[PDB]
């Protein structure tokens with residue numbers, strides 16, 4: 387009924403990813419040595435968010451919520467969740483020769499992202515921040531989503547869907563569940579090319595171009611017809627005709643993965659070789 391102090395339960399080890407998620411630490415469950423990710427927030431409601439993040443995180447493609455703690459003093463709120471030890475998808479692409487993942491790896495990771503999103507969407511939750519950095523890997527090559535729900539900063543715009551960017555005909559910016567599907571397509575281009583489209587643009591210029599530009603496309607013609615079609619589905623310009631999570635899960639690029647077993651093996655081995 388009342389949040390406990392974390393002393394002797396969880397301890398902070400080091401900042402993750404040294405300065406990319408803000409106040410998120412690699413932590414450890416004191417009594418068992420089990421690792422955990424801990425978001426540290428300064429606080430002056432909480433209990434409801436605890437019970438809410440609890441139920442929707444029980445899915446295999448979402449990092450599991452453990453509990454909430456209050457470090458007394460401004461008081462610190464500690465949000466404890468399952469740690470994913472093999473870094474982010476962005477790290478994976480960065481640590482790969484040529485900053486590009488094989489198409490079957492992209493198909494596997496994209497399906498796991500979509501499965502996580504399908505669980506949140508069915509429960510009327512919008513992730514709002516799908517990107518390579520928020521999709522984490524475990525040592526067993528399990529794919530898990532992270533960072534779903536002060537608010538004074540605007541983050542990176544490269545994964546933002548057109549409807550989420552306010553402009554003359556769209557004065558009130560629309561975060562719709564389909565906005566996460568646009569971000570999944572940008573994440574798939576990020577896996578294929580090493581960076582999102584418009585990465586060569588200043589962030590404010592990219593924010594102006596996203597609602598105006600036609601849908602982004604893969605630079606190379608080497609990819610399969612299925613992959614181009616998957617990107618096209620994610621990146622439907624007008625969210626009103628954009629397919630739902632359930633429709634994208636049935637797209638042949640996602641649905642038809644004959645080398646699935648070997649992909650998980652390749653990913654597990656690649657994690658070891660590039661650690």
Ligand SMILES: Nc1ncnc2ccc(-c3cccc(Cl)c3)cc12
Nearest residue numbers: 407410423425449468469470532533
């Ligand atoms: N669960 C995690 N495992 C490993 N690294 C991580 C890095 C960052 C995060 C993370 C990032 C933003 C917001 C929240 Cl609540 C958690 C979670 C993890």
Ligand code: NA
Nearest residue numbers: 443445448450
């Ligand atoms: Na989970």
